[PDB]
């Protein structure tokens with residue numbers, strides 16, 4: 001049969017004032033085709049499993065059809081388990097983890113392979129790897145595995161445990177090598193501070209090279225770092241001057257002016273809304289009969305009784321394919337971004353320039369220049 | 370005052386195990402009121418949803434504490450539910466460093482000791498073999514010390530490594546003839562992993578294996594002792610020390626004429642921790658009762674989830690009583706810091722050479738490691 005004209009969508013957000021939140025509202029306002037996505041977002045501590053659970057169960061008993069929100073490390077397991085038990089989908093731009101089930105739709109592309117490619121490309125054989133551990137440890141594992149495989153000499157520093165002396169200690173046996181190579185793997189909000197810290201710790205007469213293992217390159221203090229002559233390479237998800245993103249920034253620009261550069265997490269929040277819209281428009285027109293109980297269907301039971309039409313909504317969300325702010329948006333059957341392109345940017349000589357791009361199939365292709 | 374019966378919830382992975390039998394045995398030994406009344410539910414301890422259903426269900430029916438096991442996927446959920454509602458979870462599961470006062474880890478930390486031992490042996494470069502399934506706490510710790518002491522660690526997840534992949538890092542090593550390996554794996558796989566690992570050594574070279582985990586004593590000592598393998602590990606229970614010996618005695622002599630029993634040869638360390646775990650609860654509750662600090666709670670559904678979470682009022686009293694417990698158990702001196710970790714305990718280091726199984730020395734928080 002049919003679906004209602006409104007589709008209630010749950011939200012798990014860390015706060016109601018943020019640029020991701022603005023991206024969310026503005027993208028919802030761009031939708032014209034039915035059914036209408038009716039957001040019902042809650043402000044929640046995304047690090048606390050208890051609070052997230054209360055919200056998720058609260059959202060579920062209420063009959064929302066999917067949940068868009070963010071998840072932290074401590075809560076990733078709880079969210080994956082609850083989605084899998086209830087067949088309720090979670091759409092998120094948060095750092096992708098390993099071993100989600102198929103009901104978690106990850107807007108954010110995995111970086112680990114791209115990172116490996118860029119390291120091989122530069123022919124790095126030994127390097128320092130810096131990690132904070134609050135956004136997953138998969139990348140480090142992937143780095144250590146390839147290192148063992150390729151006989152690379154990797155030194156690992158989790159910044160949180162290292163006050164100032166640790167960084168200085170790495171060069172105790174580092175003369176006769178005129179170029180030190182460093183991978184920085186940390187949360188985006190924190191990238192600028194760590195970069196600033198480790199550049200201060202630099203020694204004279206050694207050449208320093210940095211590769212950013214996380215998106216977040218362009219959302220940093222670029223002028224300070226380029227003007228300092230820093231060598232830095234990172235990934236960029238959004239071409240802000242390509243045809244479709246330029247158009248989008250256009251309307252967004254006009255929208256703000258009556259009532260500046262979006263971060264990659266904002267851009268994914270905006271595509272995440274289109275993912276939901278595409279899925280629910282697609283069920284509506286496909287004539288797939290969906291109903292959901294306003295009833296307080298209790299979230300907790302043994303065994304968990306899955307929403308029976310949930311698998312239908314999971315399939316629609318997974319098969320979506322379109323051109324968004326972050327280029328081609330598409331998922332494999334496990335709910336990860338697939339068939340995406342990453343722009344590789346190299347900041348060098350007081351200049352930042354695109355040096356190529358990376359995708360799963362072609363890996364990395366150098367630009368003409 | 371105090372109820373004559375104190376309902377304790379349990380979260381157990383299995384119907385039948387040595388740990389469950391140790392749990393039961395230890396309960397039967399208690400004679401002082403109040404009665405500890407177990408209400409355990411068999412549950413998938415990897416699934417956060419099942420665990421949440423059981424935690425909430427037990428909290429609603431009025432348990433005073435929960436004794437149970439958790440896995441890498443559920444440690445965050447339990448810590449969070451314990452912290453928000455102020456019910457204590459007492460557990461021998463692999464301990465963590467982001468817990469809270471409401472989670473009593475009967476199991477002692479090993480990560481600092483492991484490093485110490487790696488020092489007394491003076492290893493500067495080595496392979497670290499680890500188990501992704503169970504956590505990366507120890508690996509991170511070692512990697513950081515590698516950093517600050519120029520150790521050159523090659524880390525290898527057993528669950529991505531092939532037979533050839535493993536020998537690869539080696540067939541290409543040739544300066545010192547010794548290849549030093551740290552094995553950090555789930556205690557159940559330890560026997561196998563050591564088995565798969567031993568054949569995979571190119572024949573003509575020497576070795577040294579250090580185990581990052583407890584489980585050493587429960588392995589096939591015979592193949593390695595016979596082999597002349599060099600294995601070093603930890604021991605937490607001395608079965609020949611006075612209090613443990615007597616505890617074994619009582620346990621063997623009851624299961625002697627009991628006509629339907631099994632589960633007694635030499636106890637796994639998890640069973641020992643489970644036995645001490647119960648004594649922790651007993652000591653805390655008998656102590657609460659003899660102090661006239663009252664308690665009680667209503668059976669009530671819908672109770673569990675709220676925003677904000679409404680913690681149990683007397684929860685903190687029970688947590689404090691459980692945390693200040695102290696005594697000689699199967700696993701030595703049982704005592705907790707305010708973070709809920711085992712404290713003031715000693716680890717014994719054991720060495721396998723020729724036909725020698727020997728204590729090399731011991732470890733603690735202030736002396737680090739002292740040779741014997």
Ligand SMILES: *[C@@H]1O[C@H](CO)[C@@H](O[C@@H]2O[C@H](CO)[C@@H](O[C@@H]3O[C@H](CO[C@H]4O[C@H](CO)[C@@H](O)[C@H](O[C@H]5O[C@H](CO)[C@@H](O)[C@H](O)[C@@H]5O[C@H]5O[C@H](CO)[C@@H](O)[C@H](O)[C@@H]5O)[C@@H]4O)[C@@H](O)[C@H](O[C@H]4O[C@H](CO)[C@@H](O)[C@H](O)[C@@H]4O)[C@@H]3O)[C@H](O)[C@H]2NC(C)=O)[C@H](O)[C@H]1NC(C)=O
Nearest residue numbers: 694695696697698700701702703704705712713714715733
């Ligand atoms: C770190 O971890 C360690 C363990 O590794 C902890 O050390 C333990 O701490 C506990 C708790 O404090 C200790 O138990 C208490 O011990 C005191 C001290 O005296 C004891 O030990 C010696 C032997 O080593 C004996 O002298 C004592 O035994 C005599 O008295 C008892 C009655 O108290 C009686 O049963 C015996 O017959 C015995 O008499 C003989 O000796 C006396 C004196 O020399 C002599 O006059 C007589 O003629 C006989 O020869 C005694 O056991 C003890 O007083 C405490 O008893 C009091 O409190 C307890 C409550 O627990 C009650 O049971 C009791 O009625 C008393 O009120 C405790 O037994 C434990 O010994 C100790 N273990 C070790 C190995 O040293 C550390 O505390 C931890 N460190 C930190 C910082 O936390």
Ligand SMILES: *[C@@H]1O[C@H](CO)[C@@H](O[C@@H]2O[C@H](CO)[C@@H](O[C@@H]3O[C@H](CO)[C@@H](O)[C@H](O)[C@@H]3O)[C@H](O)[C@H]2NC(C)=O)[C@H](O)[C@H]1NC(C)=O
Nearest residue numbers: 044045046047048049050051074448449452466467468469
């Ligand atoms: C959201 O919920 C999380 C998880 O439940 C809360 O985390 C807890 O918060 C406090 C303060 O941030 C942490 O304490 C700090 O721990 C360090 C490290 O041991 C300690 O040295 C500091 O003194 C400090 O007390 C606590 O460990 C942490 N619990 C965790 C991470 O499991 C958090 O409070 C909530 N966040 C917000 C913004 O309300």
Ligand SMILES: *[C@@H]1O[C@H](CO)[C@@H](O[C@@H]2O[C@H](CO)[C@@H](O)[C@H](O)[C@H]2NC(C)=O)[C@H](O)[C@H]1NC(C)=O
Nearest residue numbers: 178179202204205206207208209228229230231
């Ligand atoms: C950025 O990269 C350049 C080029 O690799 C680094 O320049 C090298 O620096 C060392 C030590 O000062 C010289 O001896 C090399 O011969 C330089 N090579 C070239 C080609 O210029 C430079 O130091 C790096 N920038 C920073 C800030 O570390």
Ligand SMILES: *[C@@H]1O[C@H](CO)[C@@H](O[C@@H]2O[C@H](CO)[C@@H](O)[C@H](O)[C@H]2NC(C)=O)[C@H](O)[C@H]1NC(C)=O
Nearest residue numbers: 321322323324327328329330338339340341361
């Ligand atoms: C990966 O994404 C690309 C880029 O969007 C897809 O290319 C499109 O292919 C469809 C159907 O074959 C055409 O209608 C479009 O004209 C193509 N668009 C662009 C921009 O090239 C490609 O099909 C996808 N590949 C896979 C394997 O799914």
Ligand SMILES: *[C@@H]1O[C@H](CO)[C@@H](O[C@@H]2O[C@H](CO)[C@@H](O)[C@H](O)[C@H]2NC(C)=O)[C@H](O)[C@H]1NC(C)=O
Nearest residue numbers: 080081084099100101413414415416417418442
């Ligand atoms: C207990 O729950 C866990 C996690 O919720 C289940 O784990 C899944 O197991 C399948 C089958 O091996 C794996 O392919 C998935 O990767 C696992 N999911 C996750 C999130 O890890 C597990 O199967 C359950 N165990 C039992 C005995 O039922």
Ligand SMILES: *[C@@H]1O[C@H](CO)[C@@H](O[C@@H]2O[C@H](CO)[C@@H](O)[C@H](O)[C@H]2NC(C)=O)[C@H](O)[C@H]1NC(C)=O
Nearest residue numbers: 546547573574575576577596597598599600722
């Ligand atoms: C256990 O350790 C000993 C010494 O720590 C290893 O002995 C080495 O053996 C190789 C040949 O296998 C010799 O070339 C070395 O010179 C020996 N080293 C020393 C310091 O004596 C022994 O091989 C190890 N056991 C096993 C089973 O590998």
Ligand SMILES: *[C@@H]1O[C@H](CO)[C@@H](O)[C@H](O)[C@H]1NC(C)=O
Nearest residue numbers: 236238239240241242343354
């Ligand atoms: C932006 O798109 C333009 C097309 O005008 C192209 O030249 C460039 O490769 C893109 N920018 C990045 C950073 O990839």
